[PDB]
Amino acid sequence: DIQMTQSPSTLSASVGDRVTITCRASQSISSWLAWYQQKPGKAPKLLIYKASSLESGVPSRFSGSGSGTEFTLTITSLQPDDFATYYCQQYDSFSWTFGQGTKLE
Amino acid sequence: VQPTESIVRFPNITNLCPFGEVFNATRFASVYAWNRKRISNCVADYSV
Amino acid sequence: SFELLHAPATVCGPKKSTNLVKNKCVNFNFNGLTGTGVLTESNKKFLPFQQFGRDIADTTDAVRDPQTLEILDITPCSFGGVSVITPGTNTSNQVAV
Amino acid sequence: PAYTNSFTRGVYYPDKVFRSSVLHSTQDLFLPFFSNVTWFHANPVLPFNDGVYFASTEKSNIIRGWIFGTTLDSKTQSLLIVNNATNVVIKVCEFQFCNDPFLGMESGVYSSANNCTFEYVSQPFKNLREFVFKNIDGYFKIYSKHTPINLVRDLPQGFSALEPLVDLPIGINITRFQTLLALHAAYYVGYLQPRTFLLKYNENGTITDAVDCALDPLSETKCTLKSFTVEKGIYQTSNFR
Numbered sequence: 001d002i003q004m005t006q007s008p009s010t011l012s013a014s015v016g017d018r019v020t021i022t023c024r025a026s027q028s029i030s031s032w033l034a035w036y037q038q039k040p041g042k043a044p045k046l047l048i049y050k051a052s053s054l055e056s057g058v059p060s061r062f063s064g065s066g067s068g069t070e071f072t073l074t075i076t077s078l079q080p081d082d083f084a085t086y087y088c089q090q091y092d093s094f095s096w097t098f099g100q101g102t103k104l105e
Numbered sequence: 106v107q108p109t110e111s112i113v114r115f116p117n118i119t120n121l122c123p124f125g126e127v128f129n130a131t132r133f134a135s136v137y138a139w140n141r142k143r144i145s146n147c148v149a150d151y152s153v
Numbered sequence: 154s155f156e157l158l159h160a161p162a163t164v165c166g167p168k169k170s171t172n173l174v175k176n177k178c179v180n181f182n183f184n185g186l187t188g189t190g191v192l193t194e195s196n197k198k199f200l201p202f203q204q205f206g207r208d209i210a211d212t213t214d215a216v217r218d219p220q221t222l223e224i225l226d227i228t229p230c231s232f233g234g235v236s237v238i239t240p241g242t243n244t245s246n247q248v249a250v
Numbered sequence: 251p252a253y254t255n256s257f258t259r260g261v262y263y264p265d266k267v268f269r270s271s272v273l274h275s276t277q278d279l280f281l282p283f284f285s286n287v288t289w290f291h292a293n294p295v296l297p298f299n300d301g302v303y304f305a306s307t308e309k310s311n312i313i314r315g316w317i318f319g320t321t322l323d324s325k326t327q328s329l330l331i332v333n334n335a336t337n338v339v340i341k342v343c344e345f346q347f348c349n350d351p352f353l354g355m356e357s358g359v360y361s362s363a364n365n366c367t368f369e370y371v372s373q374p375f376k377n378l379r380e381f382v383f384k385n386i387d388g389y390f391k392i393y394s395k396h397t398p399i400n401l402v403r404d405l406p407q408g409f410s411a412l413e414p415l416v417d418l419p420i421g422i423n424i425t426r427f428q429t430l431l432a433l434h435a436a437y438y439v440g441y442l443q444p445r446t447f448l449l450k451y452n453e454n455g456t457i458t459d460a461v462d463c464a465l466d467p468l469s470e471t472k473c474t475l476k477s478f479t480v481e482k483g484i485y486q487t488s489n490f491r
């Protein structure tokens with residue numbers, strides 16, 4: 001399968017600050033990435049599709065980057081409602097494996 | 106005394122050619138940009 | 154596209170094989186040596202690179218199974234003559250073999 | 251250069267047949283007993299007649315490769331058997347190399363990576379190294395042996411058989427042969443001939459002695475009787491014409 005390591009972990013930062021998270025891949029995948037939003041007690045919510053592409057109904061602070069293996073999600077301004085969990089996803093091969101996840105507070 | 110059974114023995118089947126991975130692919134190349142994969146020095150089972 | 158032979162080939166299909174039956178008369182192929190016989194375990198110690206054994210009269214008497222490297226011995230299937238022992242039909246019609 | 255006399259050396263297993271306590275008689279390419287072989291000390295190009303027997307009484311790093319070919323140019327193939335500290339590579343490749351190649355990254359590979367065909371990696375003065383190279387019916391065969399010897403300038407007195415290393419389907423022609431010295435120290439070369447031998451397989455299947463069927467009349471007598479010991483008498487061996 002694909003083993004994908006979410007190097008950043010539980011992170012603390014003040015409201016309105018730059019935050020960057022990375023999601024390294026076992027082998028290069030041609031920008032076949034999905035970022036998912038998760039909150040406690042709530043079902044997962046689709047956030048970002050196709051690496052660097054924003055979905056409708058999502059604040060513009062979220063942005064994606066990275067080609068092949070250096071996929072990264074960057075939020076320019078942190079918000080109190082942004083304290084939640086992010087999930088990685090890849091769909092290059094058919095065995096669709098998520099990421100370890102990162103925590104925000 | 107006449108022979109009853111019939112046996113044949115050959116070395117282990119090792120190093121199968123990986124055409125199975127090309128046949129099952131999540132992503133398929135466009136017709137104009139056809140992609141060539143070289144299968145070489147392996148045991149190929151076309152009965153599958 | 155099968156690129157035809159211009160140099161010695163390196164790709165083609167696997168070669169199947171059967172189980173190893175012992176202590177019975179069986180036609181046998183062991184990596185290309187063909188013959189009929191009874192195959193039994195052996196106490197011979199071939200050197201590592203040696204595949205089959207030939208005797209003083211140049212007849213194959215041992216083969217190493219290709220998959221599990223065990224030395225085995227080929228002994229010919231039983232053959233002989235049949236004789237009838239009779240006390241003569243002038244006395245009885247009961248015979249022995 | 252100088253010549254040295256080979257003392258019953260250059261015998262190898264000619265097949266993969268196991269024979270126990272037999273005096274077998276074979277006819278194949280062997281190095282004649284008590285023959286002169288050229289002695290080199292340090293290596294120009296040399297011919298390759300049916301195979302060659304190469305002996306080296308060196309151990310450290312100097313002799314770690316060979317090159318083979320007929321009319322080596324940018325079109326004809328060339329065997330590479332260069333040895334690393336942990337691997338060997340079999341590269342039969344269509345290239346030419348500059349004059350005086352050696353190992354310093356190699357000197358000859360400055361342009362010697364051209365349209366190559368086959369690759370293989372198998373094999374990773376205290377010890378004498380003996381090798382025999384044969385090329386026949388589109389097949390290259392290597393025989394090798396290692397022996398602990400001391401205080402010998404010529405080849406040692408004794409008997410040893412060369413077990414087979416590899417049988418490779420290069421399917422090309424080879425006529426010239428050369429060595430790749432690791433130039434950053436003596437070896438011997440002998441030629442094989444079609445000869446008849448009387449090999450003595452012991453109980454375990456290991457060749458213990460051999461007799462040259464054409465050395466002298468006594469060897470002819472032993473070869474005819476198929477025994478290493480003959481008793482008093484007159485034995486007819488051959489025909490004079």
Ligand SMILES: *[C@@H]1O[C@H](CO)[C@@H](O[C@@H]2O[C@H](CO)[C@@H](O)[C@H](O)[C@H]2NC(C)=O)[C@H](O)[C@H]1NC(C)=O
Binds near residue numbers: 221
């Ligand atoms: C050929 O394949 C057979 C079957 O996989 C191998 O037999 C096994 O060998 C391993 C290694 O020693 C043992 O641990 C197993 O117990 C063996 N299996 C059985 C059923 O006995 C065999 O070693 C292979 N031989 C070669 C040369 O590849």
